[PDB]
Amino acid sequence: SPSTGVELYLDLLKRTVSNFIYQVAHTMIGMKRLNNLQHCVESALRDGVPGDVLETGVWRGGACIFARGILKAYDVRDRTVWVADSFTSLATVQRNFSRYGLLDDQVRFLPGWFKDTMPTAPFERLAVLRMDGDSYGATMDVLTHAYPRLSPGGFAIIDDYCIPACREAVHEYRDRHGISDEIVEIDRQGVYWRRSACNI
Amino acid sequence: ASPSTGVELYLDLLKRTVSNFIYQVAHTMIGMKRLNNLQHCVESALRDGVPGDVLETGVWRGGACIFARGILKAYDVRDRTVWVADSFTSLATVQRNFSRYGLLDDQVRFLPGWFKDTMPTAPFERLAVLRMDGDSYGATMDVLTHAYPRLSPGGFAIIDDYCIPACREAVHEYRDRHGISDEIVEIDRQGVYWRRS
Numbered sequence: 001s002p003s004t005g006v007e008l009y010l011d012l013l014k015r016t017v018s019n020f021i022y023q024v025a026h027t028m029i030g031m032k033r034l035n036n037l038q039h040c041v042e043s044a045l046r047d048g049v050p051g052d053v054l055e056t057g058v059w060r061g062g063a064c065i066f067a068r069g070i071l072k073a074y075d076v077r078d079r080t081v082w083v084a085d086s087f088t089s090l091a092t093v094q095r096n097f098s099r100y101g102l103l104d105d106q107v108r109f110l111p112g113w114f115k116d117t118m119p120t121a122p123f124e125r126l127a128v129l130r131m132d133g134d135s136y137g138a139t140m141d142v143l144t145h146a147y148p149r150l151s152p153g154g155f156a157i158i159d160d161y162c163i164p165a166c167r168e169a170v171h172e173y174r175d176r177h178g179i180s181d182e183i184v185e186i187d188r189q190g191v192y193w194r195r196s197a198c199n200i
Numbered sequence: 201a202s203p204s205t206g207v208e209l210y211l212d213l214l215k216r217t218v219s220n221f222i223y224q225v226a227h228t229m230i231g232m233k234r235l236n237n238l239q240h241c242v243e244s245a246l247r248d249g250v251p252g253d254v255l256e257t258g259v260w261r262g263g264a265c266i267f268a269r270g271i272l273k274a275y276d277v278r279d280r281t282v283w284v285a286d287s288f289t290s291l292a293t294v295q296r297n298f299s300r301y302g303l304l305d306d307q308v309r310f311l312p313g314w315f316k317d318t319m320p321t322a323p324f325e326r327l328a329v330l331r332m333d334g335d336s337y338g339a340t341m342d343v344l345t346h347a348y349p350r351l352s353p354g355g356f357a358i359i360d361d362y363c364i365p366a367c368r369e370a371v372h373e374y375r376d377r378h379g380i381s382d383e384i385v386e387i388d389r390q391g392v393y394w395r396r397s
């Protein structure tokens with residue numbers, strides 16, 4: 001039960017982004033998934049895991065707004081929320097960020113197909129990489145070109161893992177790269193794993 | 201001015217939310233200047249140790265009262281209450297709305313009924329902020345008559361619809377009848393407030 005300013009801000013932000021207030025919503029992903037996203041960013045911040053937050057696959061922007069908000073709550077000035085998608089138009093998503101006072105230089109957009117946008121994206125490192133989308137191709141493109149920038153201790157979150165195509169992209173990528181970090185359930189559809197450094 | 205602490209962010213968001221700036225239904229339509237003024241008044245009372253509860257008379261869907269409870273919550277104030285007085289936009293609806301923000305609790309109390317009936321007996325002993333919304337001479341005078349005397353020195357009286365002649369007249373008559381000359385301060389085109397000396 002929230003009591004600090006921070007907790008109250010973040011609790012309200014979850015309620016807001018998911019339109020719990022006015023039963024349109026900026027994300028439909030639900031509390032468990034928003035909570036997980038919070039846990040992952042907070043753990044990265046807390047354990048000093050370096051890097052930005054990258055979200056691929058975007059509805060109206062609620063989960064990314066929430067991520068910028070978390071960083072704002074802890075007054076983090078040196079990390080960026082990358083928002084990657086085809087484009088639910090880009091203008092709409094910017095407007096939405098703007099509505100929460102969270103459209104600023106620490107939010108950057110990557111319009112285009114992921115095979116095009118990912119190899120060159122100016123981020124050097126990621127602390128959290130979150131994929132939303134049930135397509136094998138999108139999932140594999142993001143893994144192939146962005147996961148290698150995910151810091152040890154960082155999180156990879158797969159929103160639509162229960163969908164076989166998505167799952168398969170995830171297993172194939174992991175098996176190809178020898179990755180056996182524990183897959184942890186978030187809810188009926190999503191999972192994540194925390195990246196371990198290579199052995200020594 | 202530009203929020204950065206947890207408290208400022210919470211309150212800023214709560215203003216944006218209660219006014220439905222996010223998704224433009226809204227819980228209050230009174231606007232930022234007026235929400236800001238309400239915040240300044242509650243914060244000043246808290247900071248300057250002005251004792252008492254917050255009383256709001258005249259209620260739409262409850263946004264301004266929600267905001268007030270939120271302000272007290274942000275500074276973890278456990279010893280003051282937000283009184284929500286109105287006819288009844290039904291009482292159930294307003295409660296549900298408080299509830300949506302996680303702010304429906306024992307520090308929010310409701311006073312359904314006409315102000316001539318509800319005010320004389322309302323269990324609050326003192327007020328730090330008294331806010332009137334409504335353009336009726338009668339409602340305005342009823343609240344001033346039976347509640348203003350419980351407003352602590354240093355407390356604030358806010359008049360949402362002061363530009364409306366009927367409201368203005370109730371306010372000037374009440375002040376002249378009681379010798380009150382505390383400066384009337386403009387909030388925007390329609391509302392004003394004064395701080396009790």
Ligand SMILES: [Cl-]
Pocket residue numbers: 058059085086087088
């Ligand atoms: Cl899209």
Ligand SMILES: [Cl-]
Pocket residue numbers: 258259260286287288289
């Ligand atoms: Cl009403």
Ligand SMILES: [Mg+2]
Pocket residue numbers: 132133159160
């Ligand atoms: Mg999904």
Ligand SMILES: [Mg+2]
Pocket residue numbers: 333334360361
């Ligand atoms: Mg009014």
